Amino acid sequence: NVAHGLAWSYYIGYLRLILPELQARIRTYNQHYGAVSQRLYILLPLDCGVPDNLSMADPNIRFLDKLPQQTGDRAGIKDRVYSNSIYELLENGQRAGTCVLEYATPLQTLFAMSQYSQAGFSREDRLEQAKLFCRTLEDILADAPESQNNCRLIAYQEPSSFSLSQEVLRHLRQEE
Amino acid sequence: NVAHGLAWSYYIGYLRLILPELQARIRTYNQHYGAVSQRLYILLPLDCGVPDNLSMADPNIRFLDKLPQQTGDRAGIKDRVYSNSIYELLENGQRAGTCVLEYATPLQTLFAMSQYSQAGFSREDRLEQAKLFCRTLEDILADAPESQNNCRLIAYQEPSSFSLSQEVLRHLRQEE
Numbered sequence: 498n499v500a501h502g503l504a505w506s507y508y509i510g511y512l513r514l515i516l517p518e519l520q521a522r523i524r525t526y527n528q529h530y531g532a533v534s535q536r537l538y539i540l541l542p543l544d545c546g547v548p549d550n551l552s553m554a555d556p557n558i559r560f561l562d563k564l565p566q567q568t569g570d571r572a573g574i575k576d577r578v579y580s581n582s583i584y585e586l587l588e589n590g591q592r593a594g595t596c597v598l599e600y601a602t603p604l605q606t607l608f609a610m611s612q613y614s615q616a617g618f619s620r621e622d623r624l625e626q627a628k629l630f631c632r633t634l635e636d637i638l639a640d641a642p643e644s645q646n647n648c649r650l651i652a653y654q655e656p657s658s659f660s661l662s663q664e665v666l667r668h669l670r671q672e673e
Numbered sequence: 674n675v676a677h678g679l680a681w682s683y684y685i686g687y688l689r690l691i692l693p694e695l696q697a698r699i700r701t702y703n704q705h706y707g708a709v710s711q712r713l714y715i716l717l718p719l720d721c722g723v724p725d726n727l728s729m730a731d732p733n734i735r736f737l738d739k740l741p742q743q744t745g746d747r748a749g750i751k752d753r754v755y756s757n758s759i760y761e762l763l764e765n766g767q768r769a770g771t772c773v774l775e776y777a778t779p780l781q782t783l784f785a786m787s788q789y790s791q792a793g794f795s796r797e798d799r800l801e802q803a804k805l806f807c808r809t810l811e812d813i814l815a816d817a818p819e820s821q822n823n824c825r826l827i828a829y830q831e832p833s834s835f836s837l838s839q840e841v842l843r844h845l846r847q848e849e
């Protein structure tokens with residue numbers, strides 16, 4: 498249902514545009530301005546709980562700097578700019594990884610819609626619409642020319658205690 | 674169908690955030706840095722044809738400057754910035770108006786989706802999904818606290834010759 502269009506909007510208006518120029522932006526940040534690994538990691542909490550300050554979700558996740566901004570004219574707005582944050586991940590008090598990680602804001606938009614009444618989005622459908630957003634985005638990236646070893650999806654569901662740093666590092670470790 | 678979620682995403686992730694701080698940004702541009710009128714005009718072509726360079730849609734529409742950028746932390750991206758362009762509108766070779774006008778990029782996203790095959794969006798449904806995006810966005814703004822005399826929707830359908838400058842000025846004139 499609604500998650501479909503949100504996934505496609507997420508790809509057509511963002512991933513399709515930044516992923517091609519991401520590895521250049523990363524190569525520039527390592528030099529010009531550990532190293533920052535060459536992939537954008539997208540946090541997909543099925544909870545749809547998308548904090549704005551990441552370190553408050555897990556203190557072991559600590560913001561370090563921003564990438565060199567990428568700009569472009571998009572729909573009559575001169576120099577619309579896409580920014581991306583670089584984060585360090587801690588494990589027992591030491592830097593265990595560094596990557597460009599960020600939440601999927603459509604999930605934050607699925608949350609909000611589930612509370613506006615006129616949106617006709619019953620709030621019990623949150624978890625499924627979240628699941629279809631992941632499943633849909635996943636199939637778009639399977640056939641995406643822009644995604645040629647350039648972004649990794651981190652879906653997860655907090656059941657007690659949970660560590661999102663460990664969650665990320667795991668995906669980060671499995672690539673080496 | 675899909676236009677619904679695109680309208681809500683357009684409001685929850687954008688209008689709801691910039692409209693509150695728009696009149697401050699405009700008052701600042703008139704002074705600090707005709708005058709720029711205090712409203713964001715959103716071009717909704719039912720054609721869904723959303724050029725990126727506006728002046729190429731109508732040369733009488735000429736870009737002048739940008740507003741003072743507005744920033745905020747959104748979903749783990751530090752200092753995600755919202756920019757908006759200020760345009761001058763000509764009528765027989767003279768400045769007849771000045772406003773913050775921009776296309777609705779969801780319409781550009783409806784176009785693109787109508788050509789990706791796996792998006793399951795038949796391209797004959799473009800005009801209707803465009804019509805439901807306007808009708809839906811219109812009802813969201815009727816009850817929007819953030820929209821208290823702060824943005825005006827410019828829906829239109831090119832049938833021959835057409836002038837989008839004249840189209841805009843008309844809405845601009847009717848407010849005086």
Ligand SMILES: Nc1nc2c(ncn2[C@@H]2O[C@@H]3COP(=O)(O)O[C@H]4[C@@H](O)[C@H](n5cnc6c(N)ncnc65)O[C@@H]4COP(=O)(O)O[C@H]3[C@H]2O)c(=O)[nH]1
Nearest residue numbers: 506507510511579602603682683686687754755756778779
């Ligand atoms: N982190 C990030 N994500 C972005 C950026 N641009 C797009 N995205 C992602 O793609 C979605 C759809 O983008 P869109 O350009 O097709 O429609 C956008 C666009 O029409 C409008 N919008 C948001 N930020 C804007 C901006 N800075 N300038 C102009 N329009 C903007 O609101 C819609 C929904 O935004 P959203 O943040 O909830 O979801 C984004 C967002 O998840 C971006 O610059 N940064």
